Design an enzyme around this catalytic site. Structure first.
Site, short mmCIF file in Angstrom:
data_model
loop_
_atom_site.label_atom_id
_atom_site.label_comp_id
_atom_site.label_asym_id
_atom_site.label_seq_id
_atom_site.Cartn_x
_atom_site.Cartn_y
_atom_site.Cartn_z
CB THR G 1 -40.69 -67.89 56.53
OG1 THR G 1 -40.47 -68.54 55.13
CG2 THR G 1 -39.17 -67.89 57.13
CB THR G 2 -41.17 -68.99 62.07
OG1 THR G 2 -40.57 -68.53 63.09
CG2 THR G 2 -41.01 -70.45 61.90
CB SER G 130 -46.24 -66.34 58.61
OG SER G 130 -45.42 -67.65 58.37
CE1 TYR G 169 -49.75 -69.52 53.66
CE2 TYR G 169 -49.91 -67.92 55.53
CZ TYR G 169 -50.33 -68.37 54.36
OH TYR G 169 -51.70 -68.07 53.82
CG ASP H 9 -42.68 -66.85 53.51
OD1 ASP H 9 -42.44 -67.02 54.68
OD2 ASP H 9 -41.93 -67.19 52.80
#
Lengths: 218, 203, 194, 208, 212, 233, 195, 60, 193, 193, 60
Positions: G1-2, G130, G169, H9
């Site tokens: 994820t960002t 990430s 991710y 993550d």
């Protein structure tokens, strides 16, 4: 897998399932688990697939040089000894378990060879994930047999492992080594029949090509 | 672990008189993609190809070793290497490091001297699986295998083979985190091969 | 395993079970544990299956070699000593052997796991031997006849089979005498039904 | 050292169309290295909704029992909606966060005229999805649905997605999974949920 | 998780007009056959039997709980009811990370429904015409499945189960030849006195060994 | 203590619990309020108990929001209703937590009814008090229909088309047979409710001594003094 | 994820990636990583989806209950403190959770970065996940408090796009939000492939 | 306890994904030699040493 | 750990490396030369364990000089990178070196820029970012780099990439040394960020 | 790791802490206020795990305010420090807080400066250097500090210590917040080093 | 192998002194109950479980 070995009056029957697996994913169908060692000896193994091929290849070399040099068909004991002397030094790190069977001037011999280098002359054998399912059939149905009854007992043994073991399936390969020579039955049975699924075709327009370079073989 | 560090996947489909050998152009450093133009497929000749998944350094040094052996063999024979012989030689090279194996999985594609399609694959230590329908390796190996089993049918024409293999690879990469977005497809046939590059989700 | 060796009036009598196992599964139930070193020397292997086989394969050729260099019948003492060096020189090899034979007189040699070699009048080994030390101690008699010793081995190995899970099957027996080696067989049908 | 879970997962697929929901699951109950049974139902129904289970069968059965108990308590006034049921399932699952249910639950049903399919993880997070696959065969089937049904990467005109077409695609995907998935079962239990009712069908898969 | 005194696997199968359950009477402490008359088949009530395998102390605890629940309730239970009760008990024990190292097979005959079910230490359960527990699940079950048990009369089913148990005795260290067979029919519940299977070993002869 | 708990739980020779009978008298001692429910709106008008004009008129509010589209009016002991409102808010929040939806008003009524007579319990979060609450509530809300509910200290509740509570309850009830028809618009019905309130309320009706809550499918409106003035004039 | 959230003169920008993965397998590509708890308060979940979603919806109920009690909107400081306390109660138990509780306290924007360690930081620019490091690089070069609304949105839209372009991710759709004094508005669900 | 779900993550890693994977509950073509979990050759069936004193080995 | 960012233009290659030498808690130096120049055509920088890095780079330099003088091997960026890959790979599986390199220079085919990581993995690219720059500077490089950048634009892009680390990375960096290799030789630039 | 340097002279106390909030690889913020002014006579700064540090600091601030208002307790650096010590000690063996403090202020006995370390160890001293400053700045403090320093000299010594950290420590520090507590009140100084 | 002798005397520690110390080859007055190293109370005298299967516990 369910590689099985049965010894009868004048020969041996070595059967195996035609399946390979890496985790829960089937890797190879119709895989040939019966490895050539000599015209009168065949080996079928379970474990690290690369170690089965190379260990059975080392025996094939040593037995081919022996027969060519001395004009004398090799003994099964010579094949097992070669495998034992090779597997034992590695302490089982070369994980190869074999069912070596053949017919020599002394008769029919069937051996179980284990990764650490131990061997065992036996009358019938099962090996691999489906050995327990197979050995149950061999325990109940084994007796003094000819090749016909030995063929069906071994195939029934494989069938049990294919049906009851998760990591066994597909077809049954059979190979009989008798005093008259070895004869093979690849895909002797198709117990793991698949459905007749139709074809599926994408439109050729469904894919776009960014750039193309063409090279010609000469 | 090290294989998942660099990521990447290979797919090889066999049609009628043609092979579709294609791969993703992503090079990984873990989550980060350090290059979008790293091809993992090597060509010894227009009829002998092979790609690696796993440690990239192992793949490159194995390529140099394989090229050395292949050139020496071709000089010793003057007859070109069969793809089956190339795969067997690669398997032998892999097994010489049995106690310190390469962390690579290698697919070998090409056309036989008879001009028939050929594909195969090996594990870290050369366990070879000769193929008639298709073969895969890499992070997206499971998605590729499932979708190819669903979609592959024997004796595909060159263009139908290309489209089906491309669709399977695109849809397998779309479900793989470490799958790339730049892709390369070598359509191999007796006359040579065609290096076709396509793109996906751009993420 | 339950391997047994008793020296009686005119030779050696060795008994053993047939079961070989890994875990709760009996991989084979006809395994021959009486390994022939020579026509007059027999070895009852106990310990690692692969390592004990490796030793007995080497002891087989060493005892023959020296026999023809010496020009006399193979010596069970020399086979036992040759086993002791290998078992001692290589601690990584988990092997314990009962080597019994007849060169000039019947002899029993017990090689423990670490290479400890002792000469014995009777000897037992294997996992199932733990349960018949009292039975063998009370029941052993010097200078038994063949029938008396055969009953003794039959009784001891039977009671080890009935208690040790790793021990089962029919009782293989072999009497090495100056006249040769005679094999016996006590079927598990009798043992289990009793 | 104690392992509280057993991976009986085969594969389950849930697809929602414009006016129907197709739920299919393999009927095999897999042990380790073996097959406990070939005729265990992975699909449970709660009124007009179908609950789909994978992973550890006991955990999924317990979760289904808890869901049924809570829905029965709730139904003292009015029928529960699919959205409320999905939220309740998420809360129930998360209550076991430190000792999770090893079951990927897919809850599907109609909220009046509109079909809805909800996919859950083991820790309870739920998403409203168009097509979701759970179990060991999920990576072997999900790309097939992404391509043929959801028409991802389909640059040209799309084949019309009708109910029979989707059902045949589901049978194709389960054939592929059973071919390459070791733990995918011998029979596929296909449900079709329409606005006013649902019906079960069975089909055969290879029985290795 | 207790692993001290272990009873070997259970075999239960349904035949034309009833259900069979069979267990050996051996109990092993490690590699030692400590007890040879530990009986693990019990009748939960008329038309139902329960056979257990695993840690004997857990077997006794579970049967004690079941007996208490059977005497407490004034309402009879069908074999399905006992299956649900035992599954709940085992799953609760597992969920409290205090599992019983015991695996159970409930077999019974309802008015017309024949139950043959299994429950393992984790509370996992299934129902099938042939259910085997432990190493029986790998050795005897593949052999039993080769016969269409549904078409067997009681005597044929008993003979088939006896053959399966003989195979278990041959190919398992933790199982003996002294078995006990429990049978349930529409109007019958029977648990025989443990009896010893007859075995043969003539396959082991090699060349000339004197048959002693 | 056991003796006080028994005193709470003692039944009368007539049956009905003594404490419930006394809470019945308690719930009458309050200012009047009218609830009207029709096909499309539910109103709740209550007279404010301004003990002194120095008391801030805005601060003596009498309607409590228990959740989105649920409002609570009350008569009787005002101290008790604070706990009931807090408990109802907790129940509605928990219901949304479990089911992600606004609870059916009858669901809240059943929860409160269950809690009402559990005063004999020793555990703390599943009872209202150690006695019946000395208040009568008119709980209105919108779930799929305008709902008007009345919860009395005996723990029982009833769904109503119209009800009045407080010291003027009986007069308003005898007036409802004539002054109420569910077919009129929200504005006319609100004028009717204001007239009925004025006819029994202590001082002259105005926009500052009156509080109106009207819940509809579109909004859970609470009328400010300007709108109450617009409807009074 | 960002995930990405920052404050500029005109208001506040929030952007997320909407991918969810389980190891190498991409389980979903349309996961909504923004919890709207009211018109002036949203939370950008990152980490264990079930963990962050559960506590964020549990925090959204506390805000709703607070509004009923006080007839007044909850402050961002109290909303994030409630979330921070809940995860802190499980500190050291392996809980993985990182979020920005974005909102306005009347006329003032504030972003509180909260994570499973009990940390709680107010700031003008945060990126979590990430791909946060990639987002930080794109923002550091071009982020300014004097951005116009259109510039700020494109910076947030582009910064997430770059992170998705380079991180495994992440890379679903670029969910974009703009929160002003008058509330938040969902400005798009841009697909990263169609930039 | 919580399993660190989503750590990979949530962090740049300078494989805990967002959604829980079934794994939480090698590149060699390796099959099992026997169905038993980790057994591939006959057990070492000797008499195993027990008792004595491994804490004081040299106090013969 | 140690950051290095490199670009290649149409006819130039820019390599920027962190000139400070550091350990976990202390900065030993702040301007250390971490480049090797070969015939003014190839410039390669070494990173990682200084003890391993400087030894490997010295061996590479001397081997390349010996191969050029004795065997007339043409030293291009590709040849240097292949030699580095081989020397890293040989020790990888027995006695590994904890170091990695960026090799840049001009060849007959134009500018080339190679990256050899810890495991000997070699790959070319339009821009490189190793060390901590792999996680921070790739977004900036994607945003700013384009094929027709001028030399000054490349220097400014390198400066932006290292400014990202200066402002956001926790580890301290103060000095960067930029060596630009082009047809007119090698140009050295030292900047304090 | 988080660094703070404080020294006391005649009728004044200087506390200097780095205002940057950062983790292993990232600098989350560069100007964070890590001081609590319980009353204008006492100032304490919290360091360590931010989640634990700020939570404990808030609890301590509210407890001190409650004790001052309800129980008329005299808030002095010693009382504040003893409260810190008790709060840290109570949780030390059951729920250890990974945070440490530095309390300074004026009392009727003159300036006082207390350090409450991670384990709850309380001690008074003329100058304090916690975090990395314990290993770098004590030499500078010994060299420069003397009893009769002026307020400006104290600020300059704090600057010198944090300059040592700027130049030698590997971790990046850019901002420091200095709060001087004296009979004039509390004076705040922000410096970028 | 070298023993890291002097690491504490070489690094600031942000006990390996410069000279090797004796017995490199608690705050309680403990003393010993027996001269045997670890023994404190009688041995656990029972027949100890061996064999069977530990890696296949549930395959009875």
């Amino acid at each position: 897998t369910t590689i099985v070995g049965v010894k009868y009056k004048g020969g041996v029957v070595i059967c195996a399932d035609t399946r390979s697996t890496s985790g829960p994913i089937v890797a190879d169908k119709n895989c040939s688990k019966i490895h050539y060692i000599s015209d009168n000896i065949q080996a079928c193994g379970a474990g690290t697939s690369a170690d089965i091929t190379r260990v059975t290849r080392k025996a094939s070399k040593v037995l081919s040089i022996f027969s060519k040099t001395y004009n004398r068909l090799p003994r099964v004991s010579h094949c097992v000894r070669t495998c034992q002397l090779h597997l034992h030094p590695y302490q089982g790190h070369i994980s190869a378990a074999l069912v070596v069977g053949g017919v020599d001037d002394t008769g029919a011999h069937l051996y179980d060879v284990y990764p650490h280098g131990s061997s065992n002359s036996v009358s019938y054998t099962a090996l691999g994930s489906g050995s327990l399912a197979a050995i149950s059939i061999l325990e109940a149905g084994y007796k003094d047999m000819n090749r016909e009854e030995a063929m069906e007992l071994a195939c029934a043994a494989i069938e049990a492992g294919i049906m009851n073991d998760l990591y066994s399936g597909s077809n049954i390969d059979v190979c009989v080594i008798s005093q008259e020579g070895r004869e093979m039955f690849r895909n002797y049975k198709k117990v793991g029949v698949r459905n007749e699924v139709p074809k599926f075709q994408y439109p050729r327009s469904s894919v776009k090509i960014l750039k193309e370079d063409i090279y010609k073989y000469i | 672990d090290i294989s998942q560090h660099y990521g990447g996947s290979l797919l090889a489909m066999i049609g009628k008189s043609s092979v579709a050998f294609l791969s993703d152009k992503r090079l990984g450093s873990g989550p980060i993609s350090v290059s979008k133009n790293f091809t993992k497929i090597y060509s010894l000749t227009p009829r002998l190809f092979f790609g690696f998944t796993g440690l990239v350094s192992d793949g490159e040094m194995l390529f140099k070793k394989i090229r050395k052996n292949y050139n020496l063999f071709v000089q010793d024979n003057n007859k070109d290497m069969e793809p089956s012989e190339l795969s067997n030689m690669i398997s032998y090279i892999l097994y010489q490091k049995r106690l310190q194996p390469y962390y690579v999985a290698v697919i070998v594609c090409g056309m036989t001297l008879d001009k028939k399609p050929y594909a195969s694959s090996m594990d870290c230590i050369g366990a070879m699986k000769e193929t008639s329908e298709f073969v895969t390796s890499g992070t997206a190996s499971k998605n590729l295998m499932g979708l190819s089993e669903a979609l592959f049918y024997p004796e595909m024409e060159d263009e139908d083979l290309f489209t089906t293999s491309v669709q399977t690879f695109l849809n397998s990469s779309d479900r793989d985190t470490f799958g790339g977005m730049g892709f390369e497809c070598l359509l191999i046939n007796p006359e040579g091969y065609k290096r076709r590059e396509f793109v996906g989700r751009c993420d | 395993t339950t391997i047994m060796a008793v020296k009686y009036a005119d030779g050696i009598l060795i008994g053993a079970d047939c079961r070989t196992s890994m875990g709760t599964y009996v991989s084979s139930r006809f395994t021959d544990k009486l390994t022939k070193i020579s026509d007059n020397i027999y070895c009852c292997r106990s310990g690692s299956a692969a390592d004990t086989q490796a030793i007995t394969q080497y002891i087989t050729e060493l005892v023959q070699r020296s026999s023809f260099i010496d020009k006399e019948i193979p010596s069970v003492k020399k086979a036992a000593m040759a086993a002791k060096d290998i078992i001692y020189r290589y601690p990584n090899m988990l092997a314990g052997l009962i080597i019994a034979g007849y060169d000039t007189k019947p002899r029993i040699f017990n090689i423990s796991l670490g290479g400890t070699m002792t000469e014995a009048e009777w000897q037992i080994g294997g996992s199932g031997s733990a349960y018949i030390y009292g039975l063998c101690d009370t029941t052993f008699k010097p200078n038994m006849n063949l029938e008396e010793a055969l009953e003794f081995v039959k009784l001891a190995v039977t009671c080890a089979i009935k208690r040790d899970n790793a021990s089962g099957g029919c009782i293989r027996m072999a009497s090495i005498t100056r006249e040769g080696v005679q094999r016996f067989f006590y079927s598990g049908d009798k043992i289990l039904n009793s | 050292k104690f392992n509280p879970y057993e991976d009986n997962s085969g594969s389950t697929v849930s697809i929602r169309l414009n006016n129907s929901i197709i739920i299919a699951a393999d009927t095999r109950h897999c042990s380790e290295m073996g097959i406990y049974s070939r005729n265990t139902s992975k699909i449970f129904r709660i009124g007009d909704f179908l609950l789909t289970i994978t992973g550890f069968y006991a955990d999924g059965y317990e979760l289904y029992n808890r869901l049924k108990y809570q829905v029965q308590i709730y139904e003292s006034f009015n029928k529960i909606s699919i959205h409320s049921l999905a939220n309740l399932a998420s809360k129930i699952m998360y209550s076991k966060r430190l000792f999770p249910y090893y079951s990927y639950v897919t809850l599907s049903g109609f909220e009046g005229d509109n079909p809805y399919v909800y996919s859950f993880d083991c820790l309870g997070h739920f998403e409203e999805v168009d097509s979701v696959c759970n179990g060991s065969g999920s990576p072997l089937i999900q790309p097939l649905l992404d391509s043929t049904i959801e028409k991802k990467n389909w640059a040209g005109e799309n084949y019309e997605v009708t109910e029979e077409y989707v059902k045949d695609i589901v049978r194709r995907g389960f054939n592929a999974a059973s071919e390459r998935d070791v733990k995918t079962g011998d029979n596929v239990e296909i449900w079709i949920i329409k606005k006013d009712g649902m019906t079960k069908e069975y089909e055969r898969l290879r029985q290795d | 998780m207790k692993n001290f005194v272990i009873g070997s696997g259970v075999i239960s199968l349904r035949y034309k007009n009833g259900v069979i359950t069979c267990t050996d009477t051996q109990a092993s402490y490690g590699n030692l056959c400590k007890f040879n008359d530990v009986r693990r088949i019990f009748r939960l009530s008329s038309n139902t039997l329960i056979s257990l395998s695993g840690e004997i102390s857990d077997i006794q605890f579970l049967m004690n709980e079941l007996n208490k629940l059977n005497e407490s309730d004034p309402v009879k239970m069908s074999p399905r009811g006992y299956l649900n009760l035992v599954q709940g008990i085992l799953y609760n024990k597992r969920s409290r990370v205090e599992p019983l190292n015991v695996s159970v097979s409930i077999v019974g005959v309802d008015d017309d429904d024949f139950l043959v079910s299994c429950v393992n230490h984790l509370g996992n359960f299934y129902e099938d015409n042939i259910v085997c527990t432990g190493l029986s699940n790998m050795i005897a079950l593949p052999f039993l499945r080769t016969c269409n048990v549904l078409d067997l009369e009681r005597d044929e089913a008993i003979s088939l189960v006896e053959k399966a148990m003989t195979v278990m005795c041959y190919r398992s260290c933790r199982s003996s030849n002294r078995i006990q067979i429990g049978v349930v029919e529409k109007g019958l519940v029977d648990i025989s006195d443990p009896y010893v299977l007859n075995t043969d070993w003539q396959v082991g002869h090699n060349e000339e060994e004197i048959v002693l | 203590s056991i003796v006080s708990r028994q005193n709470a739980n003692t039944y009368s020779a007539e049956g009905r619990l003594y404490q419930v009978e006394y809470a019945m008298q308690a719930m009458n001692l309050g200012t009047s309020s009218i609830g009207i429910k029709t096909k499309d709106y539910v109103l709740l008008a209550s007279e404010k108990k301004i003990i002194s004009k120095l008391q801030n008129p805005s601060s003596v509010k009498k309607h409590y929001r228990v959740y989105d589209h649920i409002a609570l009016g009350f008569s009787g002991i005002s101290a008790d209703v604070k706990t009931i409102v807090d408990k109802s808010r907790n129940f509605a929040i928990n219901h949304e937590y479990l089911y992600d939806e606004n609870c059916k008003v009858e669901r809240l009524l059943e929860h409160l009814a269950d809690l009402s007579l559990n005063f004999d319990k020793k555990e703390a979060d599943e009872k209202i008090f150690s006695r019946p609450f000395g208040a009568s509530l008119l709980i209105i809300g919108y779930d799929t229909e305008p709902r008007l509910f009345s919860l009395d200290p005996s723990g029982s509740y009833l769904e109503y088309h119209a009800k009045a509570i407080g010291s003027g309850s009986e007069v308003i009830e005898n007036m409802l047979e004539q002054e109420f028809d569910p077919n009129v618009d929200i504005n006319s019905g609100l004028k009717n409710i204001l007239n009925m309130l004025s006819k029994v309320m202590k001082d002259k009706i105005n926009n500052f001594n009156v509080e109106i809550t009207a819940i509809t499918k579109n909004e859970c409106k609470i009328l400010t003094p300007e709108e109450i003035e617009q409807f009074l004039e | 994820t960002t995930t990405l959230a920052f404050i500029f003169q005109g208001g506040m920008v929030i952007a997320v990636d909407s991918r969810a993965s389980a190891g190498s397998y991409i389980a979903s590509q349309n996961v909504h990583k923004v919890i709207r708890v009211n018109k002036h308060l949203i939370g950008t979940m990152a980490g264990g989806a079930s963990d962050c979603y559960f506590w964020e919806k549990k925090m959204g109920l506390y805000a709703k209950l607070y509004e009923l009690k006080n007839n007044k909107r909850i402050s961002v400081s109290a909303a994030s403190m409630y979330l921070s306390n809940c995860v802190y109660s499980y500190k050291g138990q392996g809980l993985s959770l990182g979020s920005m509780v974005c909102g306005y306290d009347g006329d003032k924007p504030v972003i509180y970065y909260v994570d499973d360690a009990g940390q709680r930081l107010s700031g003008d620019l945060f990126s979590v996940g990430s791909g946060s490091t990639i987002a930080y690089g794109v923002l550091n070069e071009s982020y300014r408090f004097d951005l116009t609304k259109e510039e700020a949105l494109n910076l947030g839209k582009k910064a997430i796009w770059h992170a998705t372009h380079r991180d495994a991710y992440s890379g679903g759709n670029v969910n974009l939000y703009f929160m002003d004094k008058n509330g938040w508005e969902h400005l798009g669900t841009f697909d990263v492939d169609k930039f | 306890g919580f399993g660190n779900v989503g750590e990979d993550d949530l962090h740049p890693q300078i494989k805990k994904g967002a959604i829980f994977s079934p794994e939480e509950f090698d590149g060699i073509d390796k099959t099992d030699i026997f169905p038993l979990k980790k057994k591939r050759d006959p057990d070492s069936d000797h008499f195993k040493k027990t008792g004595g004193d491994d804490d004081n080995p040299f106090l013969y | 750990m140690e950051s290095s960012v490199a670009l290649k233009g149409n006819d130039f290659v820019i390599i920027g490396t962190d000139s400070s030498v550091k350990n976990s808690y202390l900065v030993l130096k702040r301007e250390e030369d971490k480049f090797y120049n070969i015939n003014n055509k190839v410039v390669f920088t070494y990173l990682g364990d200084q003890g391993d890095a400087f030894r490997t780079s010295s061996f590479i330099n001397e081997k390349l000089v010996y191969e050029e003088i004795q065997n007339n091997v043409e030293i291009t960026p590709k040849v240097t990178a292949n030699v580095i890959q081989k020397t890293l790979y040989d020790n990888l599986r027995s006695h590994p070196k904890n170091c990695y390199f960026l090799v840049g220079g001009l060849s007959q085919d134009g500018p080339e820029l190679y990256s050899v990581d810890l495991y000997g993995s070699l790959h070319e690219n339009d821009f490189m970012a190793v060390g901590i720059s792999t996680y921070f500077c790739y977004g900036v490089l994607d945003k700013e780099y384009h094929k027709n950048i001028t030399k000054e634009d490349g220097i400014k892009i390198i400066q932006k990439c290292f400014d990202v680390l200066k402002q956001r990375c926790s580890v301290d960096i103060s000095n960067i040394e930029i060596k630009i290799v082009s047809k007119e030789g090698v140009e050295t630039i030292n900047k304090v960020l």
